[PDB]
Scaffold this active site. Structure first.
Site, PDB file in Angstrom:
ATOM      1  N   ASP A  25      33.464  43.527  27.289  1.00 25.76           N
ATOM      2  CA  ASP A  25      32.786  42.515  26.498  1.00 25.76           C
ATOM      3  C   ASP A  25      33.498  42.393  25.135  1.00 25.76           C
ATOM      4  O   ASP A  25      33.644  43.377  24.395  1.00 25.76           O
ATOM      5  CB  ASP A  25      31.311  42.903  26.371  1.00 25.76           C
ATOM      6  CG  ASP A  25      30.453  41.880  25.608  1.00 25.76           C
ATOM      7  OD1 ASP A  25      30.953  41.015  24.872  1.00 25.76           O
ATOM      8  OD2 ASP A  25      29.222  42.003  25.758  1.00 25.76           O
ATOM      9  N   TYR A  65      22.628  47.926  26.539  1.00 25.77           N
ATOM     10  CA  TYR A  65      23.709  47.137  27.134  1.00 25.77           C
ATOM     11  C   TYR A  65      25.005  47.463  26.394  1.00 25.77           C
ATOM     12  O   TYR A  65      26.061  47.714  27.009  1.00 25.77           O
ATOM     13  CB  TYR A  65      23.408  45.603  27.108  1.00 25.77           C
ATOM     14  CG  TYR A  65      24.650  44.797  27.366  1.00 25.77           C
ATOM     15  CD1 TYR A  65      25.103  44.589  28.657  1.00 25.77           C
ATOM     16  CD2 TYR A  65      25.341  44.223  26.327  1.00 25.77           C
ATOM     17  CE1 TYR A  65      26.266  43.855  28.896  1.00 25.77           C
ATOM     18  CE2 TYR A  65      26.500  43.492  26.538  1.00 25.77           C
ATOM     19  CZ  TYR A  65      26.960  43.310  27.830  1.00 25.77           C
ATOM     20  OH  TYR A  65      28.118  42.632  28.049  1.00 25.77           O
ATOM     21  N   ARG A  88      28.987  33.701  40.312  1.00 24.83           N
ATOM     22  CA  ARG A  88      29.462  33.662  38.921  1.00 24.83           C
ATOM     23  C   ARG A  88      30.836  34.280  38.822  1.00 24.83           C
ATOM     24  O   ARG A  88      31.693  33.957  39.634  1.00 24.83           O
ATOM     25  CB  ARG A  88      28.412  34.256  37.961  1.00 24.83           C
ATOM     26  CG  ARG A  88      27.097  33.487  37.998  1.00 24.83           C
ATOM     27  CD  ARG A  88      25.944  34.133  37.257  1.00 24.83           C
ATOM     28  NE  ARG A  88      26.346  34.477  35.902  1.00 24.83           N
ATOM     29  CZ  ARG A  88      26.512  33.627  34.906  1.00 24.83           C
ATOM     30  NH1 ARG A  88      26.206  32.315  35.052  1.00 24.83           N
ATOM     31  NH2 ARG A  88      26.924  34.083  33.733  1.00 24.83           N
TER      32      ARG A  88
HETATM   33  N1  LIG Z   1      28.835  35.835  31.130  1.00 22.69           N
HETATM   34  C1  LIG Z   1      29.325  36.148  29.939  1.00 22.69           C
HETATM   35  O1  LIG Z   1      29.346  35.363  29.006  1.00 22.69           O
HETATM   36  C2  LIG Z   1      29.871  37.532  29.708  1.00 22.69           C
HETATM   37  C3  LIG Z   1      30.186  37.925  28.405  1.00 22.69           C
HETATM   38  C4  LIG Z   1      30.705  39.196  28.185  1.00 22.69           C
HETATM   39  C5  LIG Z   1      30.925  39.990  29.287  1.00 22.69           C
HETATM   40  N2  LIG Z   1      30.607  39.588  30.551  1.00 22.69           N
HETATM   41  C6  LIG Z   1      30.848  40.538  31.653  1.00 22.69           C
HETATM   42  O2  LIG Z   1      31.563  39.939  32.727  1.00 22.69           O
HETATM   43  C7  LIG Z   1      30.984  40.416  33.969  1.00 22.69           C
HETATM   44  C8  LIG Z   1      30.472  39.207  34.769  1.00 22.69           C
HETATM   45  O3  LIG Z   1      29.500  38.480  33.976  1.00 22.69           O
HETATM   46  P1  LIG Z   1      28.413  37.582  34.717  1.00 22.69           P
HETATM   47  O4  LIG Z   1      27.757  36.702  33.684  1.00 22.69           O
HETATM   48  O5  LIG Z   1      29.078  36.995  35.925  1.00 22.69           O
HETATM   49  O6  LIG Z   1      27.358  38.691  35.207  1.00 22.69           O
HETATM   50  P2  LIG Z   1      25.862  38.559  35.693  1.00 22.69           P
HETATM   51  O7  LIG Z   1      25.740  37.212  36.345  1.00 22.69           O
HETATM   52  O8  LIG Z   1      24.895  38.898  34.591  1.00 22.69           O
HETATM   53  O9  LIG Z   1      25.742  39.746  36.740  1.00 22.69           O
HETATM   54  C9  LIG Z   1      26.781  40.053  37.641  1.00 22.69           C
HETATM   55  C10 LIG Z   1      26.178  40.735  38.859  1.00 22.69           C
HETATM   56  O10 LIG Z   1      25.824  42.070  38.547  1.00 22.69           O
HETATM   57  C11 LIG Z   1      25.045  42.518  39.613  1.00 22.69           C
HETATM   58  N3  LIG Z   1      24.041  43.498  39.251  1.00 22.69           N
HETATM   59  C12 LIG Z   1      23.101  43.388  38.307  1.00 22.69           C
HETATM   60  N4  LIG Z   1      22.270  44.440  38.333  1.00 22.69           N
HETATM   61  C13 LIG Z   1      22.726  45.275  39.332  1.00 22.69           C
HETATM   62  C14 LIG Z   1      22.341  46.560  39.932  1.00 22.69           C
HETATM   63  N5  LIG Z   1      21.291  47.232  39.475  1.00 22.69           N
HETATM   64  N6  LIG Z   1      23.098  47.069  40.927  1.00 22.69           N
HETATM   65  C15 LIG Z   1      24.140  46.392  41.398  1.00 22.69           C
HETATM   66  N7  LIG Z   1      24.562  45.226  40.918  1.00 22.69           N
HETATM   67  C16 LIG Z   1      23.874  44.626  39.921  1.00 22.69           C
HETATM   68  C17 LIG Z   1      24.256  41.291  40.171  1.00 22.69           C
HETATM   69  O11 LIG Z   1      24.340  41.212  41.604  1.00 22.69           O
HETATM   70  P3  LIG Z   1      23.235  40.422  42.508  1.00 22.69           P
HETATM   71  O12 LIG Z   1      23.331  39.004  41.972  1.00 22.69           O
HETATM   72  O13 LIG Z   1      23.857  40.571  43.907  1.00 22.69           O
HETATM   73  O14 LIG Z   1      21.877  41.018  42.434  1.00 22.69           O
HETATM   74  C18 LIG Z   1      24.937  40.113  39.486  1.00 22.69           C
HETATM   75  O15 LIG Z   1      25.404  39.139  40.402  1.00 22.69           O
HETATM   76  C19 LIG Z   1      29.880  41.426  33.621  1.00 22.69           C
HETATM   77  O16 LIG Z   1      30.393  42.769  33.726  1.00 22.69           O
HETATM   78  C20 LIG Z   1      29.530  41.038  32.217  1.00 22.69           C
HETATM   79  O17 LIG Z   1      28.956  42.070  31.458  1.00 22.69           O
HETATM   80  C21 LIG Z   1      30.088  38.381  30.770  1.00 22.69           C
HETATM   81  N1  LIG Z   2      26.003  41.069  32.937  1.00 24.08           N
HETATM   82  C1  LIG Z   2      26.108  40.227  31.930  1.00 24.08           C
HETATM   83  N2  LIG Z   2      25.613  38.970  32.040  1.00 24.08           N
HETATM   84  C2  LIG Z   2      25.708  38.090  31.011  1.00 24.08           C
HETATM   85  N3  LIG Z   2      25.161  36.885  31.187  1.00 24.08           N
HETATM   86  C3  LIG Z   2      24.376  36.545  32.367  1.00 24.08           C
HETATM   87  C4  LIG Z   2      23.738  35.192  32.025  1.00 24.08           C
HETATM   88  C5  LIG Z   2      24.717  34.569  31.040  1.00 24.08           C
HETATM   89  C6  LIG Z   2      25.185  35.757  30.207  1.00 24.08           C
HETATM   90  C7  LIG Z   2      26.304  38.500  29.810  1.00 24.08           C
HETATM   91  C8  LIG Z   2      26.569  37.932  28.616  1.00 24.08           C
HETATM   92  C9  LIG Z   2      27.192  38.825  27.859  1.00 24.08           C
HETATM   93  N4  LIG Z   2      27.346  39.964  28.567  1.00 24.08           N
HETATM   94  C10 LIG Z   2      26.823  39.798  29.763  1.00 24.08           C
HETATM   95  N5  LIG Z   2      26.689  40.659  30.796  1.00 24.08           N
END
Ligand SMILES: NC(=O)c1ccc[n+]([C@@H]2O[C@H](COP(=O)([O-])OP(=O)(O)OC[C@H]3O[C@@H](n4cnc5c(N)ncnc54)[C@H](OP(=O)(O)O)[C@@H]3O)[C@@H](O)[C@H]2O)c1
Ligand SMILES: Nc1nc(N2CCCC2)c2cc[nH]c2n1
Ligand SMILES: NC(=O)c1ccc[n+]([C@@H]2O[C@H](COP(=O)([O-])OP(=O)(O)OC[C@H]3O[C@@H](n4cnc5c(N)ncnc54)[C@H](OP(=O)(O)O)[C@@H]3O)[C@@H](O)[C@H]2O)c1
Ligand SMILES: NC(=O)c1ccc[n+]([C@@H]2O[C@H](COP(=O)([O-])OP(=O)(O)OC[C@H]3O[C@@H](n4cnc5c(N)ncnc54)[C@H](OP(=O)(O)O)[C@@H]3O)[C@@H](O)[C@H]2O)c1
Ligand SMILES: NC(=O)c1ccc[n+]([C@@H]2O[C@H](COP(=O)([O-])OP(=O)(O)OC[C@H]3O[C@@H](n4cnc5c(N)ncnc54)[C@H](OP(=O)(O)O)[C@@H]3O)[C@@H](O)[C@H]2O)c1
Ligand SMILES: Nc1nc(N2CCCC2)c2cc[nH]c2n1
Ligand SMILES: Nc1nc(N2CCCC2)c2cc[nH]c2n1
Ligand SMILES: Nc1nc(N2CCCC2)c2cc[nH]c2n1
Ligand SMILES: Nc1nc(N2CCCC2)c2cc[nH]c2n1
Ligand SMILES: Nc1nc(N2CCCC2)c2cc[nH]c2n1
Lengths: 250, 250, 251, 252
Positions: free
Chosen positions: C144, C157, C13
Site C-alpha cells: 500500500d 490494516y 478486482r
Molecule cells: N483498491 C485500492 O485502492 C488499494 C489501495 C492500496 C492497496 N491495495 C491492495 O491491493 C490488493 C487488491 O486490492 P483490492 O481492492 O482488489 O482488494 P479487495 O477487493 O478489498 O479484496 C481482495 C480480496 O481479498 C480476499 N479476502 C478478503 N478477506 C479474506 C479472508 N479472510 N481470507 C481470504 N481472502 C480474503 C477477498 O476474496 P473473496 O472476494 O473471494 O471473499 C477479496 O476478493 C490488496 O492487497 C489491497 O490491500 C488496494
Molecule cells: N483490501 C483492500 N481493499 C481496498 N479497497 C476495497 C474497496 C476499495 C478499496 C483498499 C484500499 C486501500 N487498501 C485496500 N485494501
C-alpha cells in the site's frame, strides 16, 4: 512516427545500454556525452546504420556553473532540432569520486561536478524538458545505497539524495502536464573491466541475489519499463535494481 | 571552561530560539547572520549582558559561490577566535522560496537554495571537523515534509534532501572522531509574521497535535536534546518535530 | 511446459486482473478465493476456454488461526497437484475495514482477519512456496503506497501492511540464495467500488496528481507482470508504487 | 500528585532501565513482567524503598490469543487501580528469536509470540490506554528496532512484528492526537549484549557500530524514552528516534 529520447552520459557503460535499448524499442535518441567523443560518435554511427536518421550526439559539460541552464536547454533543444519532439529524458550522467570531510580539484570544483551532474543538471534538464513540450516521462538514475552511503562520498551522496527529491518534486508538479517522473536505483552494476579483481570480488560478494553485479542491460530493462505503456500510472516511484544489496546489514 | 556553539541564521525566529537555549544551558554562541544585522547585534548584546563575552556575531552570505568555502571556514574560525573551541554546529540558515519548473535567474536560485540548505552545511561541517568530557556534535535543520514536498519548491526540496544525505554521510564518517551528526525536522513552525492569521490557520488546521504550529522554542528543545549528554549514542538520526503533520494524507 | 502461479484473492478486482494477465502471459493459474465462489469459477471457466487445463480454484479463509499454516500449505499444494510446479506466488488477498482505537466483530477477530490476510498468510504461503523449492521463481506482495500516511482509524490494516513490507524485505534476503525474488506492488487508489459514494470517490480521485483518477486493475497488474518477468531478474526486495503520485501529496 | 507509567517487560535489561528512569523523574510505575517474577518484585521493592507506594508489579503473557485484549485491558486497569491514573505507556516487552522460512515451537506459536508481543499487544495496550483516559502530558513510547529495513537473516516474523509496530506508532499518533496523546518510538541498534554471549560474537556486533564500536547501554536507550515523554517533546508525535550509534547507516 517514432518518439525521441535524450540519454545523458550515454557514450558508454550504463547510459549506452539505456540508449541502445531505447533505440531497439523504436526510439530515436540523442546520445549526450562530455569527454567520450569517440565512443559517442561510434555509437550514433552504429545506431544510424541500423535505422537511418535515428541518432545524434550532443556534447555538454554538466558541471554546475552560471551557464549550465543554457547548456541544459541546448540539450533539449538538440533533440527537437534533430527529431522534432522530445518524449523521454533519462538523467544518467554522473560524476562519482570521494570527497573526504577531513585530488588537484578544489572543493569548489568537487561541489560543482558532484552536485551539478547528479542533481542540478537533472533539474535544469527537467525544466527545459517540460517547458519545451504521447507518453512523456523522465527517468533519473539514482542509487540504491543512498541511505547506507560509502565512506568519504558525502558530496556524491548529497547529489543523489537531491535527485530523489527532484524525482518526487517533479513528479508532483509535472503530473498535470501528463509528464511522469521516476527513478531507477542501481546497486552494484557493470564494474569496469580495469577495476582490480580483488575489489570487484569484494563488491560482487555483497549481493544476496547471485553474488554478482547487475548488467547494464538489467538496469536498462527497468528504464524501459518505466517509459513504457505498462507504467502509465507510475510517477514518483524509484525502482531499486540492486539484487537485495540495500537490505543487507553491516 | 564552557563549551561553544555556532548557530547559522541565528538572528531571528527558530535560529534565535536555538541560540538562546544553548546559551541558557551554558554555551557561548556565535550568532551567524546574513541580512538581519540589527537583530543579530542586539541578540548578542542581550546574551553578553547576561554573561560577559559569551556571544559574538558573524556575518556571511551562504549562497553557493567561489568564496563560500572561505566564508564557512571563517565562521568556524570566529568561534575559535572568540572562545578557543567549537563544540557544536547548528546548520539552521536556509533560503526558502518557490522555483516553478514551468527577477532572480535560475542559476542564482540554485546558488541560494542549494548553497544555504546543503553546500554551506557541508563546508561548515568540513571546517568544523578539520579543527578537531568531549561532546562534539552537529545538528542540521531538516524538513519533516521532505517526502511530501510543496508544489513548485523543487530546488528547496533538493536542498533539504541533500541535507539528509549530508547528515547520514557525515554521521558515518565523523563517528571515529567522536562527532555526532543529527537533524531536527520541523513541519509547520513559525509562519511568516506578515502572513494573515486566516492563512496561518490553514496550515495550522493540518496539524494533528493541537491544530497549531510549533513554537521556535519547541524546535530548539529537540536541538538541546541532541547536543546533550542524553543523546551520546545518537548519531545519524533525524527527529521530526511536526505534531504529526508528515503522517497526514492528502 | 508452462510456469504456474498462485494468486490469492483472485476472483474479483485487482486479483482477477493479475490472474488474467499472468494467464495471458502464458502462466497456468490457481485462483484462490474466500467468499467469491461464483466469480472464481466463472473466471476459471473463461481462462480454461482460452487454453485447456490452465486454471483451477482453491478456496480458503486466510484469517489467522491454528489451521492457517495448513490452509496455506494446501493452497501451494493445489498448484503442484494441478500443474506439477509453482513458479510465482502473488499475495493479493486482504481484509480492509476500520478498527478505531477509541470506541460487531470482536477485536480479536479483527486482529485475526486484518493481520492474518495482510501479513501472516503471506508469510505462511511464502514458507510453503519456498519449502517446495533456468527457472524464474518469484513472489509479489500487494502492499500500500499510503502505508506511511495512513487513513484515520485503520491501525490494524496499516499494521498488517507494514508487516507485509517487512516480510517482503526479510524474504528477499533469505530466499535470494534459492534464486527466489521477493517484491511488492503498492497501489494508491484503485478501482473504487459502487459501495462508495460519489462525494467520497471524487474526494479520493481528486487527490491523485496524475490525471485525478484511480488506477485500473490492469495498471496494477502491469507492475506485477513486470516484476515476475525476465526484465526484473536482478530486482529483489523492491516495492514499486503504482499510485499516480498520490503518496507525494502533502495534507 | 505524581503521574504514573506502565512499562512492559520491565523486570530487567532495557525495560528496567526505563522504569527506573521514569521513577527517578517522579513517575509511579507499573512494572509488567511475564516470567521474571523475582526480578520484577525485587525492582518494585527498591523503588518503593525510595518512595513508598510508587511501584507495583503486574504479570501478563503478551502472546497473541483471544484473551490478549482482556490481558492488555487489565494491565492498564492495574495502573488505575494502583495510582488513579495512567499518563505514560512504554511498549518494551518483546519476543525475539529466529524463524527460518526453509526447514521446538510450532509455527502457530511463533506467530502468536513474535507478532503478539511486538505488535498486537502494543495495539491493544494503546486502545485500552486511550479508552481509559478520564496540566496533562499523556504519551506512548514504542520500542522499535533501528535495523528494521536491514533485517537479520531468518528473523522474518520478528521483523514483521517490528514493522507492524512502526505502523502502529504512526497510526496511533494520528488518531490519538485529538485526545492529546502523543505516540513515538525509540529504535535501538545494538544494545546491552547478554553476558551469556561469547566474547567473539559480542565483538562481531560491537565492531559494526561506527560511534565508539560499542553497544548502547540500557541507560542510553532509556534517555531517549525519557526525552519523548518529557515536556521537551510536547510537539513531537509519530517520530521514531534511532539510538544506534550509526549502525543503520553502515552498508554491507
Ligand atoms: N483498491 C485500492 O485502492 C488499494 C489501495 C492500496 C492497496 N491495495 C491492495 O491491493 C490488493 C487488491 O486490492 P483490492 O481492492 O482488489 O482488494 P479487495 O477487493 O478489498 O479484496 C481482495 C480480496 O481479498 C480476499 N479476502 C478478503 N478477506 C479474506 C479472508 N479472510 N481470507 C481470504 N481472502 C480474503 C477477498 O476474496 P473473496 O472476494 O473471494 O471473499 C477479496 O476478493 C490488496 O492487497 C489491497 O490491500 C488496494
Ligand atoms: N483490501 C483492500 N481493499 C481496498 N479497497 C476495497 C474497496 C476499495 C478499496 C483498499 C484500499 C486501500 N487498501 C485496500 N485494501
Ligand atoms: N555500480 C554502478 O556503476 C552504479 C551504482 C549506483 C548508481 N549508479 C548510477 O547509474 C548511472 C550510470 O552509472 P555508470 O557507472 O554507467 O556511470 P559512470 O561510468 O560513472 O558515468 C556515466 C557518465 O557520466 C558522464 N559525466 C561524468 N561527469 C560529467 C560532466 N561533468 N558533465 C557531463 N557528463 C558527465 C560521463 O560522460 P563522458 O564519458 O562522455 O565524459 C560518463 O560516461 C549513474 O547515474 C550512476 O550514479 C551506478
Ligand atoms: N518555519 C517552518 O515552518 C519550517 C519548516 C520546515 C523546516 N524548517 C527549517 O528550520 C530552519 C529555521 O526555519 P525558519 O522559518 O526560522 O527560517 P527562515 O526564517 O526562513 O530563515 C532563517 C535564516 O536563514 C538565513 N538565511 C537565509 N538566506 C540566507 C543566505 N543567502 N545566506 C545566509 N543566511 C541566510 C536568514 O538570515 P538573515 O535573517 O540574517 O538574513 C534567516 O533569518 C530552516 O533550516 C528551515 O528550513 C522550518
Ligand atoms: N537488545 C537489543 O540489541 C535491541 C535491539 C533492537 C531493539 N530492541 C528492542 O528494545 C526492547 C528491549 O530490548 P531487550 O533486549 O531489553 O529485550 P529482551 O531482554 O529480549 O526482553 C524484554 C522483555 O520482554 C518480555 N517478554 C518476552 N516475551 C514475552 C511474552 N510472551 N509476554 C510478555 N512479555 C514478554 C520479557 O519478560 P520476562 O523476562 O518477564 O518474561 C522480557 O523481560 C525490545 O522491544 C527490543 O526488541 C533491542
Ligand atoms: N556515476 C557513478 N559511477 C559509478 N561507478 C563508475 C565505475 C565504478 C562505479 C558509481 C557507483 C556507485 N554510484 C556510481 N555513480
Ligand atoms: N551503490 C554504490 N556502489 C558503489 N560501488 C560499487 C562499484 C564500486 C563502488 C559505491 C562506491 C561508493 N559509493 C557507492 N555506491
Ligand atoms: N527556511 C525556511 N523557512 C520557512 N519559512 C519561513 C517563512 C515561513 C516558512 C520554511 C517552511 C518550510 N521550510 C522552510 N524553510
Ligand atoms: N526482544 C529483543 N531482544 C533482543 N535481544 C535479547 C538478548 C539479545 C538481543 C533483541 C535484539 C534485537 N532485537 C531484539 N529484541
Ligand atoms: N538491532 C538488532 N540487533 C540484533 N542482535 C543484537 C545482538 C544479538 C542480535 C538482531 C538480531 C536480529 N535482528 C537484530 N537487530
Amino acid at each position: 512516427e517514432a518518439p525521441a529520447a535524450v540519454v545523458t552520459g550515454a557514450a558508454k557503460r550504463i547510459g549506452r545500454a539505456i540508449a541502445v535499448k531505447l533505440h531497439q524499442t523504436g526510439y530515436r535518441v540523442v546520445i549526450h556525452y562530455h569527454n567520450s567523443a569517440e565512443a559517442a560518435v561510434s555509437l550514433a554511427d552504429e545506431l544510424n546504420k541500423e535505422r537511418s536518421n535515428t541518432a545524434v550526439v550532443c556534447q555538454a559539460d554538466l558541471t554546475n556553473s552560471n551557464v549550465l541552464p543554457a547548456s541544459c536547454e541546448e540539450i533539449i533543444n538538440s533533440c527537437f532540432r534533430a527529431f522534432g519532439r522530445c518524449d523521454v529524458l533519462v538523467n544518467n550522467a554522473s560524476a562519482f569520486y570521494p570527497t573526504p570531510l577531513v585530488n588537484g580539484k578544489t572543493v569548489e570544483t568537487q561541489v560543482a561536478e558532484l552536485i551539478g551532474t547528479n542533481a542540478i543538471a537533472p533539474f535544469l534538464l527537467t525544466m527545459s524538458f517540460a517547458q519545451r513540450q504521447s507518453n512523456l516521462s523522465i527517468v533519473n538514475l539514482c542509487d540504491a545505497m543512498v541511505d547506507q552511503p560509502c565512506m568519504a562520498f558525502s558530496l556524491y551522496n548529497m547529489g543523489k539524495h537531491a535527485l530523489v527529491g527532484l524525482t518526487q518534486s517533479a513528479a508532483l508538479e509535472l503530473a498535470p502536464y501528463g509528464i511522469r517522473v521516476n527513478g531507477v536505483a542501481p546497486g552494484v552494476s557493470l564494474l569496469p573491466v580495469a577495476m582490480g579483481e580483488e575489489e570487484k570480488d569484494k563488491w560482487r560478494r555483497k549481493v544476496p541475489l547471485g553474488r554478482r553485479e547487475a548488467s547494464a542491460e538489467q538496469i536498462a530493462d527497468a528504464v524501459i519499463f518505466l517509459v513504457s505503456g505498462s507504467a502509465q500510472y507510475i510517477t514518483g516511484s524509484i525502482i531499486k535494481v540492486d539484487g537485495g544489496l540495500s537490505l543487507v546489514h553491516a
